[PDB]
Amino acid sequence: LFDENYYAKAVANIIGEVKDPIMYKWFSPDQIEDVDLQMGYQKTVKWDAFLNANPTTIANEVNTISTIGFSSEVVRLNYLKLQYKFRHLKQTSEKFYTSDSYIGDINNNLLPFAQAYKLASSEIIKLINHFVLTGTVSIQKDGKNQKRLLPNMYGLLNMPEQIKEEVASGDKDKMDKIFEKIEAGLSKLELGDEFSTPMMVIVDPATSLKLVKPYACEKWEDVLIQTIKAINNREDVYIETSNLLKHKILIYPLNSELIKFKPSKYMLPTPNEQVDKDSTDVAHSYIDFVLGGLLATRKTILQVNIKQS
């Protein structure tokens, strides 16, 4: 294959230069599990058992014993296939544009296939990170013109049936009021028997600036960490800052028994076999990626919104 497909050879050579996605920091290693699918839906079945009565004492002869029941629950997940196109220089035309220690038309912004693919992959990976955190696909800082997505495709921020807390715009700058909502939201959390697990905090830059302020010789960040430690059995609490959020605070456990991520194993960018060729030196190529695969239980994610108006 590599003897015939130059582009496939080029991708295999330069696949290692693509940086790792930053979303991996938001999950524990056990929380991610790949699936084999491109587009469609997949059903997940979770099984449970419960005790129907007190256990039966075994003494002398007996035939009536207590029973243990079972239950099942099905959750549907949707997966969507998305594609992009980019232009690059034809392989046989590279010799006519190899300049002094750089290849490509500066005037015409044309690049070799290898460099074009690497840069394109980096941009797409950033977009995938935005979706997983937010649940929306948008290329604008405003977050508008969102591409319409299928249901059963949610991010950590818009996952339904979770504890949503809203801060009034009058208290947008009052850390005590913001922390009060957090405490109320934290109380409403329902971790059940899995409460002994590390927790993750995701904040926006504006919130982080407020956190490092003194607690009204302690900081709001320290108070928040202690409060979370009170419920997670005194375990690790990680705090992260992301520019993709705007006046939002995300708290959720890093436990595979509560939140599970099941992306398609083709989610990350993958080259397409079709290449557009013509009589000129410019060709076109396509990159494929798949979105979806987030699964979470009810009332296990705390989403706090600080309204600005």
């Binding site: 294959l1 590599f2 497909n5 496939a8 991708v11 295999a12 696949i15 290692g16 790792d20 991996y24 920091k25 290693p29 991610i32 790949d34 690790d236 990680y238 194993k265 083709y266 990350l268 993958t270 076999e273």
Partner: protein
């Protein structure tokens, strides 16, 4: 079948895609191995 393996030689585009997915999976595993908090 992984692109990280030098001895690996794909036969067709389908195997090439499988190698890419395996490569991504191993890198994620390696990332979590090297991650420190």
């Amino acid at each position: 079948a992984s692109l990280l393996d030098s001895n690996f030689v794909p036969i067709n585009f389908t195997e090439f895609v499988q190698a890419i997915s395996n490569t991504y999976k191993q890198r994620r595993i390696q990332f979590y191995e090297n991650l420190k908090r």
